[PDB]
Amino acid sequence: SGAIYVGNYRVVNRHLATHNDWANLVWEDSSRDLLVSSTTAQGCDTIARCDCQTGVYYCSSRRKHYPVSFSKPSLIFVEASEYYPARYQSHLMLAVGHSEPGDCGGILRCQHGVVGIVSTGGNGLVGFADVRDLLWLDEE
Ligand SMILES: CNc1ccccc1S(C)(=O)=O
Numbered sequence: 459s460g461a462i463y464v465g466n467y468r469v470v471n472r473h474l475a476t477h478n479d480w481a482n483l484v485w486e487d488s489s490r491d492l493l494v495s496s497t498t499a500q501g502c503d504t505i506a507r508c509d510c511q512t513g514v515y516y517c518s519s520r521r522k523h524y525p526v527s528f529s530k531p532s533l534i535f536v537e538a539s540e541y542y543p544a545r546y547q548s549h550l551m552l553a554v555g556h557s558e559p560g561d562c563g564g565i566l567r568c569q570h571g572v573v574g575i576v577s578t579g580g581n582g583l584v585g586f587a588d589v590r591d592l593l594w595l596d597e598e
C-alpha cells in the first residue's frame with residue numbers, strides 16, 4: 459500500500475484505488491498502473507522534476523528504505539502478479555531490489571522529491587510507476 463499526497467491530489471496504484479478514489483477521480487491510466495483522486499486536506503509530498511536514475515524507495519515487506527539505481531521510464535513487459543496478468547506497462551522504471559505485491563505504493567524519492575511509486579515485483583527487480591512527467595500534479 460501507499461500514496462503520494464501532493465497538494466489536493468492522492469496518487470495511488472490504479473489496482474489499489476478505492477471506491478472513494480473512483481468517486482473523486484482526476485485521472486487514471488491502466489497501462490501505467492496509476493490513478494489520481496482529489497483530497498480535502500493538502501499533502502506533505504513534493505514531486506521530482508528531473509531525469510535522476512538514483513534514489514531511495516520504501517519496501518514495506520522489509521520495513522526498510524533502500525538506495526537504488528533505476529532505469530528511465532519505459533514500456534516494459536511485466537510477468538503475472540496477484541493483482542495483474544502478464545502484460546506490458548508504460549512509464550515503468552526498473553531497479554535491482556526486493557518487491558512483493560503489498561510493497562506497491564512505496565515511494566521512490568531522489569534529491570528533487572518523489573519520483574514514483576512501487577508498481578511491480580519479482581525475480582529480484584522492483585518496478586516504479588514514474589510520476590515526474592505529470593506536471594499538472596504541481597498546480598490546480
Ligand atoms: C507513453 N510514453 C512512453 C511510453 C513508455 C514509457 C515512457 C514513455 S515517455 C516517452 O512518455 O517517457
Ligand SMILES: [Zn+2]
Binds near residue numbers: 509568569
Ligand atoms: Zn531527481
